[PDB]
Amino acid sequence: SPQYPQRRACPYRPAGGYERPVTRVRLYDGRPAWLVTGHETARQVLLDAATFSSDRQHPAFPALAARFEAIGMDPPEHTAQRRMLISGFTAKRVATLRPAITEIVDSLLDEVVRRGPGVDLVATFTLPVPSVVICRLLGVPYADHEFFEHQSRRIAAGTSTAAESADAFGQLKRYLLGLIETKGRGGEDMLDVLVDEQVATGTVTTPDLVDLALLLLVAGHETTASTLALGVALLLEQDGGAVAADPTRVGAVVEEILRHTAVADGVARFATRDTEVAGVRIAAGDAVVVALSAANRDPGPFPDPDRFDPRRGGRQHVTFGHGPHQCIGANLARAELEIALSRLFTRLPTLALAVPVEELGGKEAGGVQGVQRLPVTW
Numbered sequence: 001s002p003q004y005p006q007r008r009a010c011p012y013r014p015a016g017g018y019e020r021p022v023t024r025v026r027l028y029d030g031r032p033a034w035l036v037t038g039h040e041t042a043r044q045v046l047l048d049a050a051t052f053s054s055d056r057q058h059p060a061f062p063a064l065a066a067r068f069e070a071i072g073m074d075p076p077e078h079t080a081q082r083r084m085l086i087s088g089f090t091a092k093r094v095a096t097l098r099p100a101i102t103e104i105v106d107s108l109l110d111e112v113v114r115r116g117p118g119v120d121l122v123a124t125f126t127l128p129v130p131s132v133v134i135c136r137l138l139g140v141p142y143a144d145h146e147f148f149e150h151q152s153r154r155i156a157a158g159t160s161t162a163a164e165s166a167d168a169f170g171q172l173k174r175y176l177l178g179l180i181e182t183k184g185r186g187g188e189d190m191l192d193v194l195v196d197e198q199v200a201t202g203t204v205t206t207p208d209l210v211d212l213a214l215l216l217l218v219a220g221h222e223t224t225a226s227t228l229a230l231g232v233a234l235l236l237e238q239d240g241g242a243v244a245a246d247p248t249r250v251g252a253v254v255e256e257i258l259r260h261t262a263v264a265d266g267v268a269r270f271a272t273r274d275t276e277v278a279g280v281r282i283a284a285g286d287a288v289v290v291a292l293s294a295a296n297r298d299p300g301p302f303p304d305p306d307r308f309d310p311r312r313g314g315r316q317h318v319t320f321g322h323g324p325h326q327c328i329g330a331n332l333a334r335a336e337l338e339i340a341l342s343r344l345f346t347r348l349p350t351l352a353l354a355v356p357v358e359e360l361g362g363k364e365a366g367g368v369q370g371v372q373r374l375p376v377t378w
């Protein structure tokens with residue numbers, strides 16, 4: 001049985017070779033698992049939320065890495081907590097944030113240009129853009145963006161010790177417990193939505209609201225950052241800068257970057273009951289991992305799956321999952337990726353890797369996939 005997950009040799013090309021639509025793998029600690037690799041079967045498993053549980057608190061729930069063996073919407077509260085958050089992620093709300101996002105993107109590209117050719121785009125642009133956008137989504141005031149960017153970078157850089165990362169988490173938790181006491185006082189940001197819902201229902205504690213805000217930061221930061229960095233590397237390889245600069249094409253270019261990069265490579269479930277997926281017999285308690293990256297390269301819905309093609313038709317990719325746990329932030333993540341890539345390649349059309357692609361350095365198998373650094377000239 002092959003190991004899952006494996007290290008990406010090239011960080012913007014997922015580890016494939018897995019048989020479809022279902023195959024047997026071994027997790028890091030030897031636990032057997034069904035890996036779901038077909039696109040249709042991916043959707044079926046993610047939609048069948050009673051049979052395929054994401055209850056991380058249940059003892060059968062599979063860990064994909066040692067570091068994650070040792071925040072999240074618990075099952076009884078899930079639909080209520082999700083409905084709370086979704087009111088802060090309307091299409092109108094994201095459209096309203098676009099001007100703020102392009103201001104954040106431009107001020108970080110000012111810093112890229114100030115430093116000059118040789119700059120690491122990860123530390124200066126790809127990591128900071130999505131933490132500062134989450135600042136603006138939450139209502140974190142401009143004066144505190146530097147502190148918040150710095151502590152969220154400590155968690156996500158994947159260069160800090162487990163202790164340095166726990167420290168940074170605690171600082172952001174402290175900061176947000178302070179800030180939320182000032183919210184619901186005329187603002188329309190995510191922290192005001194949460195206060196207004198607590199004030200209206202009286203059944204949510206302020207610590208639970210801080211936990212929900214930290215969940216958004218953790219779900220929305222490294223994922224968006226790593227799909228932005230990998231997007232840039234992939235566009236530079238494909239000579240695709242110019243298409244990303246095109247305001248009519250950047251939406252479709254971003255869908256194709258999401259399909260390719262699938263930075264949340266797999267999501268874990270466990271069977272709560274005996275079932276069958278594509279004829280395969282699944283016992284209650286069995287690990288079931290949905291390989292979103294592999295579902296995204298199923299040659300049925302995505303013929304010529306490995307080619308970069310923004311014009312691609314057919315079914316939606318599952319980079320953001322599907323069904324009742326589908327990415328709440330998907331619309332915000334698209335807007336962010338579109339404005340960041342559009343403004344980067346308009347301002348710096350001659351952008352190029354300052355080292356060979358083979359020297360970018362990938363992240364570890366277990367976590368959000370990505371590069372450690374992205375040095376660039378123009």
Ligand code: HEM
Pocket residue numbers: 046054073082085134215216217219220221223224225227262263264267268292318319320321322324325326327328329330332333
């Ligand atoms: C490129 C960016 C992103 C990727 C690849 C991504 C990926 C995912 C995936 C695969 C899921 C489904 C988890 C599962 O089924 O087990 C998910 C859920 C979620 N995402 Fe995202 N995401 C992105 C951006 C964001 C952003 C920007 C936010 C918030 C600001 C966010 C917040 C969440 C939340 C709260 C959930 C949980 C929803 C639930 O369980 O009901 N994500 N994301």
Ligand SMILES: [Cl-]
Pocket residue numbers: none
């Ligand atoms: Cl150090």
Ligand SMILES: [Mg+2]
Pocket residue numbers: 058059061
């Ligand atoms: Mg456990």
Ligand SMILES: [Mg+2]
Pocket residue numbers: 115116118119120
């Ligand atoms: Mg520099």
Ligand SMILES: [Mg+2]
Pocket residue numbers: 014259260261262292293294296297
């Ligand atoms: Mg893929």
